[PDB]
From a paper:
The mature [name]-1 capsid is composed of the capsid (CA) protein arranged in a conical lattice of hexamers and pentamers. CA assembles into a conical lattice formed by roughly 200 CA hexamers and exactly twelve CA pentamers, the latter of which facilitate lattice curvature and closure around the viral genome. Monomeric CA consists of two folded domains connected by a flexible linker: The N-terminal domain (NTD) faces the outer surface of the capsid, where it stabilizes the hexamer, while the C-terminal domain (CTD) forms dimeric interactions that link hexamers together. Here, we present cryoelectron microscopy structures of continuous regions of the capsid lattice containing both hexamers and pentamers.
Finally, we extended our lattice templating approach to understanding the interaction of the capsid-targeting antiretroviral compound GS-6207 (lenacapavir; marketed by Gilead Sciences as Sunlenca®) with CA. We determined the structure of this compound bound to SUV-templated CA lattice at an estimated resolution of 3.1 Å. Consistent with crystal structures of cross-linked CA hexamers bound to GS-6207 (45, 46), we found that the compound binds to the ‘FG binding pocket’ between the NTD and CTD of adjacent hexamer monomers. Importantly, this site is also targeted by FG motif-containing host cell proteins CPSF6, Nup153, and Sec24C. GS-6207 density was completely absent from the pentamer, indicating that the compound binds exclusively to hexamers. This selectivity appears to arise from spatial constraints imposed by subtle conformational differences between pentameric and hexameric CA as the FG binding pocket is altered in the pentamer by a structural “switch” between NTD ɑ-helices 3 and 4. We attribute this selective binding to a structural “switch” in the CA NTD that promotes a conformational change in CA monomers and drives oligomerization to either the pentameric or the hexameric state (40 and 35). This conformational change reshapes the FG binding pocket in pentamers, resulting in a steric block of GS-6207 access to the site. Work described in the accompanying manuscript demonstrates how this remodeling also prevents binding of FG motif-containing host cell proteins CPSF6, Nup153, and Sec24C to pentamers.
Author numbering:
A (entry chain A), B (entry chain D): 12 to 85, 96 to 220
C (entry chain C), D (entry chain C), E (entry chain C): 1 to 85, 96 to 222
The structure:
Amino acid sequence: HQAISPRTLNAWVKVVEEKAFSPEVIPMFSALSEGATPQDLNTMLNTVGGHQAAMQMLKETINEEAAEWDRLHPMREPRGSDIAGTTSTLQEQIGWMTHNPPIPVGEIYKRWIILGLNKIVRMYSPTSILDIRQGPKEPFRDYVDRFYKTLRAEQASQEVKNWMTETLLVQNANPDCKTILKALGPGATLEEMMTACQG
Amino acid sequence: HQAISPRTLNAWVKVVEEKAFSPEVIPMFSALSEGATPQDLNTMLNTVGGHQAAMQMLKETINEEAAEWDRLHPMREPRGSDIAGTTSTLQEQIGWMTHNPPIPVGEIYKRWIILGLNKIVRMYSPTSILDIRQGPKEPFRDYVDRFYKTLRAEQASQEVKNWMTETLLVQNANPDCKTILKALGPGATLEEMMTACQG
Amino acid sequence: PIVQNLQGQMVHQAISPRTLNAWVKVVEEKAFSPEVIPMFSALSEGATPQDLNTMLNTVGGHQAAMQMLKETINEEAAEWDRLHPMREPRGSDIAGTTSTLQEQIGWMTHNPPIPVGEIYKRWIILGLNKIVRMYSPTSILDIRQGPKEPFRDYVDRFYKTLRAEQASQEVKNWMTETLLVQNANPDCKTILKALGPGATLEEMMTACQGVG
Amino acid sequence: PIVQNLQGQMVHQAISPRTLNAWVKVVEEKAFSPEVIPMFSALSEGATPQDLNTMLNTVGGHQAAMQMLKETINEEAAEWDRLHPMREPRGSDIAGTTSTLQEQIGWMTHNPPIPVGEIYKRWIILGLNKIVRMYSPTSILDIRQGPKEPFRDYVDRFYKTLRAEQASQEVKNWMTETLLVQNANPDCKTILKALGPGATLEEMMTACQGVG
Amino acid sequence: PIVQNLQGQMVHQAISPRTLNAWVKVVEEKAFSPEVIPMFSALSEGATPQDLNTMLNTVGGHQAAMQMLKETINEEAAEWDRLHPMREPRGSDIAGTTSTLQEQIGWMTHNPPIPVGEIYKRWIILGLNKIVRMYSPTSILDIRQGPKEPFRDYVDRFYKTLRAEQASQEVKNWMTETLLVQNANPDCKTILKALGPGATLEEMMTACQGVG
């Protein structure tokens, strides 16, 4: 066991401040927090500047997951608060991690944090994808890039997302690209759509 | 034992000069000062640039905590001044930390510095949590961000902060959103609250 | 009332003068508000029919109220005689006009007890409920929250008028559920309807705190 | 209550009619202010569960308050039965609905005593605290000193609202320390902040005498 | 209190519920005016330390007042222990927190009597005097006769504020002699100074009848 290096905290702060809570911060958090105890995760989340409403969402989600863990699971065994790093201590956490088999309180807490971060990203989505419409001059590549960005941020289910990509993307296109998309018709990959909709 | 590298001091200087004394400075100080002697802590505190009023406040708080330690407590026994590093050597500080059992003079000094930094953070936070109020035209997201930043800088007990989160957020909202928040009622989560108050 | 002798023989204990004075103050000063029935029940605890008649003698100053109290007592006595044809206490004898004190003490001390005092008390309370219903300054449909009135004061007025109204229990439940919301001012009524149906009085009160 | 016989055998002493009338006056006139709980404690000193039920029968006029008083009593009885599985007094029997008088007298006279009356009194006081919390006209955050209001009157209003609020003890301490100063008018608030943190209520009152 | 048995053995007589209710009404309604100390003395006549503690339990609703009442009681108990080093009643045992009832009855019934109840009553009255001093709306120097105020009303306000002030006796004498005249309005003040020094309150009142 080694204490969290400063450079990881600097990287976490930098990515959070530069990317906001965009969908790409989840993998960055997951990679930075590799092998991190609940104390380290708490320090990482405390270093975040701004976005304190989002941090409140995250800790509310952690509370919900801790309550669910306590409901499902009625040395000392770890409870939801212990896994969250509130009532437990560093020695207990690292002991649980080093037990054979390991009791990875860090990984479970990281899963809870990832769920809360996904909720944060969905809430921080600037606009609903129903309002993402191609302008009368915007290129199809730019419009569709924005569309799939909003779709990734919205985190809709796969079955719904298939319908959205199939129909809504075509329906929201501007009249010229709209006509070319009808001419292409269904069953066409996005490769065909964008290579045919050029200019 | 190893003397602190210049990278740690450069990181401390960078975070202080960039973020000022925001609540996120506390975890950064805690992470940077891991396993640090009082001499290392004094060097880290000396490397700071401006905010000399804040540094004087930290000195005063450390003096108060040293007086309290001397009152509590009637190789050589470490006193408050010895903990502060004014009347102690690096060798004596390596002592009491390599001692069997150890009395971690470094951790106590870090705790006093953390108390002083909490006081400085509250001083640098301009407005009181009771005074944080939603503007008539302000978005609820911005208002909640300001509210939770101020609350994190508020420096009160945890139960008190829980009560503040429960009550003051609804109490201080503008009349346009306060009626919606009352209709939601107690028990509504923050995600529900800021989805409802999106308009 | 009735108390035990040193030898255990139950004997009369007349209602004290200041208890009667308290009853007189209730009758004269309260103007037959709903609270006179709780106060009549309190001041006449374990009272014999003779004690109840002594209490009614002070109500006797009010001619109309006394006359309909007497008429309701007579109706209830007739109903008791119809349904219930020392000796068995006759319905007229429950009122104490005919019976003597020792018969009443014997009936209340019987094994099992014959609570004649409680029965006459219930008849008197029925008559007082009628009188209270008459003297209500306004009907429940007329209670309305003002623009400035706090929801607590309006709720108190509404529930006092509901006590005076004395409708059926299901009707009262509907009234508290719907008419309470209907008569609130628009500022409170918005939150009242936002809470939706089924809200208890506690939620309704807490949500409307300081809205006025 | 319970009193000694001439031979030392403990016997019932029913709550007097005027004590019940005082309780009825408290319930009807005070509109469930915080002071009803001290007054309920005073008027029901050394009272058996039967006496407490007699007192609650007068509260019964208020439908909502009685219903949640009953629900809180039931919850506390269930908790007592869970934690505590003549005979041992069952939690439902502490309420007196099932038990008879002699069992209650025996339990309160036991060596060591089984204060069933005090337990039922505590449950009733919990329910009355809930009712008092509901009926508060304003929240503690809404109490504000006016430009003319003396600091004494404002402090009295603040502390009465604090009693109605019934937050945690640490929360109450923070409230009295900080929110009391925050809500004072600027003329007093200047002196309040000049005194600095840690000032007791005595210093705060003396320094702000006649400032308005 | 304490009463004689039929056989002459002194036994406890608990403070009645309505006396406690009267004390609660005094505490809640009067807002700690000077009159609470006479009323506390009246309602606690011949009271044991247990009875005094029962009375203080109702004051306990007011957090600050209870806390400084307790602190003054502790200070007086410490002073008693310092000056006074069954057994001899310890100063902490005068408060009744440690002692039991029979010890208190024995001490109050001793030959010569050990008035422990009166001593604890004096300590409580000292604490209540402190609380009364705090809650005074204005200082004695701020009491002033208005242009229309009769001299009788102004004198009553002045003397009530003097009771709340609780300065030294010589200081109080000087205040009544000089400050009472100084604060009167010019119409009355002319006659007040014309009477000259040494005028008793009777002459001062009679001469200023109807002057306003």
